[PDB]
C-alpha cells in the first residue's frame, strides 16, 4: 500500500505580527515538499530528488495553493478565538492533515481530512467521505456551515480523484526511492542493571519504510508487560531506527528471543545474545 | 499536489 499526506501547522504569535505557517508533504515516510511563512523563498520547496523534475507550472500552482491555505488559516485562528471567547494575548495552534491511501494496484483505499485546535481533535471527515465528526460545540458551528455549503462533495472529488492521481504520478517518477524496501540491519547489546539482572536491547537500523514490529519472547510468550519500545526515529538519511528492551535475570539471557517483522524481510528475523 | 479547498472553519 502507499499514502500521500500533507501536514499544516498555523501558530498565532501575539507580539511578533503574522502567524507562523508550516506545510510538509509526504509520500509514505519520504518528505517531498515544505513551505515555511518565515523562510526567504515564500515558495513551496523540494525535499526529495524526484520532485525537482517537476517544472515551473507545478511549483507556481503548489506555491499559490499553499499560500492560499495559509491565508485561510490566518482567518481560522481569528474565528476560533471568537468560538472559544479567547483574546489575542495567547498563542493558539491550528493543525490540518489530508491525503489518500492506495493499495498495491494503486486504487483508492481511503481519504483523510482532519483539524485540531490547541492539540485536540476539532473536526474530521468520516471514513465514508460523506459526513463530519465534530469534537465539540465550536466544531458543530463549522459542521453546519460545511453541510450547508456541500463542502464534502468537492473534498471527496480531491481525496478519491486528484489526490490518487498525484500519488500515482509521484510513485512512477520517484520509483527508485519510493518503491523500495530497506531491510532492517538487526543487532543486540547487553547491560548489567544489577548483580541479579541485565538489560537486553534489540536493535533494527537503516530500515525503510518506518512500519516495523520488534517483539521480545521469554520461552515463546510475548513480554507485552515488560518490554520498553522507543518511538521509531529518523536516521536523517531517509531510513529509520528502533529498539526494544527487556530486563532479564542475569545468566538467563539465553531464554529470551527478539522477533523483527518488516516488509523488506522475506522471513521474520529472530535474535539471541552472543557473549 | 495540494487540495484547492476554499472552506473556512
Amino acid at each position, epitope marked *: 500500500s502507499h499514502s500521500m499526506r500533507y501536514f499544516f501547522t498555523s501558530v498565532s504569535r501575539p507580539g511578533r505580527g503574522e502567524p507562523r505557517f508550516i506545510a510538509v508533504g509526504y509520500v509514505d515516510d519520504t518528505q517531498f515538499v515544505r513551505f515555511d511563512s518565515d523562510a526567504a523563498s515564500q515558495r513551496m520547496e523540494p525535499r526529495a530528488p524526484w520532485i525537482e523534475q517537476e517544472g515551473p507550472e507545478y511549483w507556481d500552482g503548489e506555491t499559490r495553493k499553499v499560500k492560499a491555505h495559509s*491565508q485561510t488559516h490566518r482567518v481560522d485562528l481569528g474565528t476560533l478565538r471568537g468560538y472559544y471567547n479567547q483574546s489575542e494575548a495567547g498563542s493558539h495552534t491550528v493543525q490540518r492533515m489530508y491525503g489518500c491511501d492506495v493499495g498495491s494496484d494503486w486504487r483508492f483505499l481511503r481519504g483523510y481530512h482532519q483539524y485540531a485546535y490547541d492539540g485536540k481533535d476539532y473536526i474530521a471527515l468520516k471514513e465514508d467521505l460523506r459526513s463530519w465528526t465534530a469534537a465539540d460545540m465550536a466544531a458543530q458551528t463549522t459542521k453546519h456551515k460545511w453541510e450547508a455549503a456541500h463542502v464534502a462533495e468537492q473534498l471527496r472529488a*480531491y481525496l478519491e480523484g486528484t489526490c490518487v492521481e498525484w500519488l500515482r504520478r509521484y510513485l512512477e517518477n520517484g520509483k527508485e526511492t519510493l518503491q523500495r524496501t530497506d531491510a532492517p540491519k538487526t543487532h543486540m547489546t547487553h547491560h548489567a542493571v544489577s548483580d541479579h539482572e541485565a538489560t537486553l536491547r534489540c536493535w533494527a537500523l537503516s530500515f525503510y519504510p518506518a512500519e516495523i514490529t520488534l517483539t521480545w519472547q521469554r520461552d515463546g510468550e510475548d513480554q507485552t508487560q515488560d518490554t520498553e519500545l522507543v518511538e521509531t526515529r529518523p536516521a536523517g538519511d531517509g531510513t529509520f531506527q528502533k529498539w526494544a528492551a527487556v530486563v532479564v535475570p542475569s545468566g538467563q539471557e539465553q531464554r529470551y528471543t527478539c522477533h523483527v517483522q518488516h516488509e523488506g524481510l522475506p522471513k521474520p528475523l529472530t535474535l539471541r545474545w552472543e557473549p | 499536489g*495540494l487540495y*484547492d479547498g*476554499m472552506e473556512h472553519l
Partner: T-cell receptor, first 110, second 112 residues
Framework: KEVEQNSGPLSVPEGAIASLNCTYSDRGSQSFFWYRQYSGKSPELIMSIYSNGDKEDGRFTAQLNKASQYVSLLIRDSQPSDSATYLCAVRGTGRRALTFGSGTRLQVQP | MNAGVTQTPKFRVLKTGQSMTLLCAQDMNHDYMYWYRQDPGMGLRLIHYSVGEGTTAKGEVPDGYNVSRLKKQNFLLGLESAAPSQTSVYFC?????????FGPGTRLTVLE
C-alpha cells in the same frame, strides 16, 4: 483563451437536447460551474461539477472530461424558457475567484 | 442564495468626474465577495475580490476602481472619478467556497 465557449446562437427545437460546451487552459482546475443569464438579469447557478463523469439535476446534466479539459451542460427536453446565455466558469489552480467564459446564446424554438 | 446578495443602486447616470460607491450586501456569512463588470462580447470581468474582512485583491480589470471590506457582510466598489469607459453593468457575488451567488446588478451610464 483561459475559458472558451462559442458565442452561438445555438438554435434547437423544443423537446431536443442542447449541449453547451466549454474548454479551459489550466489542467489543475478543480471546480467547474454552469450559470444561466436571461437578458438584463443576473447569472443564476445551474450546476457545479468536480469529478470526471456525469452529474444530473432535473433536466440538466453536466459532464466533465479533465483529460480533454472539456466540460458540457446538457439540457434535456429543452423548453423556450431555457432561451438565455449560458456561462461556463472555471477556478484555476490555487485561485480564489472564478474565470467566466464569454457565454453561449441558446435559443429554444417553439 | 442569489436572494441573499443585495446590491444598490439599481441604476445611476453620472457626469464624467463624479464619484459613487456601489454597495454589495450578503447575510450568509460568506468569506468571499466579488465585483465584476459585464460588457457585450466581453462577458463577466473580475474588477476586485475579497477572501475576508479587511483584505482585498486585484481582479482582471482593477484600474479606476477601489474596494473596501471593513465588515464581512459588505463589499464596497468606489468610482473615484467616473469615466465613459466605466459605463457598464456591475454584478457583485459572494461564496462560502467557490459557488458564487450574484446580486441583481447595477446599470451605470457615464456622460460628458
Amino acid at each position: 483563451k483561459e475559458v472558451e465557449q462559442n458565442s452561438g446562437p445555438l438554435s434547437v427545437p423544443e423537446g431536443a437536447i442542447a449541449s453547451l460546451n466549454c474548454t479551459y487552459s489550466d489542467r489543475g482546475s478543480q471546480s467547474f460551474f454552469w450559470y444561466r443569464q436571461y437578458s438584463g438579469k443576473s447569472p443564476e447557478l445551474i450546476m457545479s461539477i468536480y469529478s470526471n463523469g456525469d452529474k444530473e439535476d432535473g433536466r440538466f446534466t453536466a459532464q466533465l472530461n479533465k483529460a480533454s479539459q472539456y466540460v458540457s451542460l446538457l439540457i434535456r427536453d429543452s423548453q423556450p424558457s431555457d432561451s438565455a446565455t449560458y456561462l461556463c466558469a472555471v477556478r484555476g489552480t490555487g485561485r480564489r475567484a472564478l474565470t467566466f467564459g464569454s457565454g453561449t446564446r441558446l435559443q429554444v424554438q417553439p | 442564495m442569489n436572494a441573499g446578495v443585495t446590491q444598490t443602486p439599481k441604476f445611476r447616470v453620472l457626469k464624467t468626474g463624479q464619484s459613487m460607491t456601489l454597495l454589495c450586501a450578503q447575510d450568509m456569512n460568506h468569506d468571499y465577495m466579488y465585483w465584476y463588470r459585464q460588457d457585450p462580447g466581453m462577458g463577466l470581468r473580475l474588477i476586485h475580490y475579497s477572501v475576508g474582512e479587511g483584505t482585498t485583491a486585484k481582479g482582471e480589470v482593477p484600474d479606476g476602481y477601489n474596494v473596501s471590506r471593513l465588515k464581512k457582510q459588505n463589499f464596497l466598489l468606489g468610482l473615484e472619478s467616473a469615466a465613459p469607459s466605466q459605463t457598464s453593468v456591475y454584478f457583485c457575488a459572494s461564496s462560502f467556497t467557490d459557488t458564487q451567488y450574484f446580486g441583481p446588478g447595477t446599470r451605470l451610464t457615464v456622460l460628458e
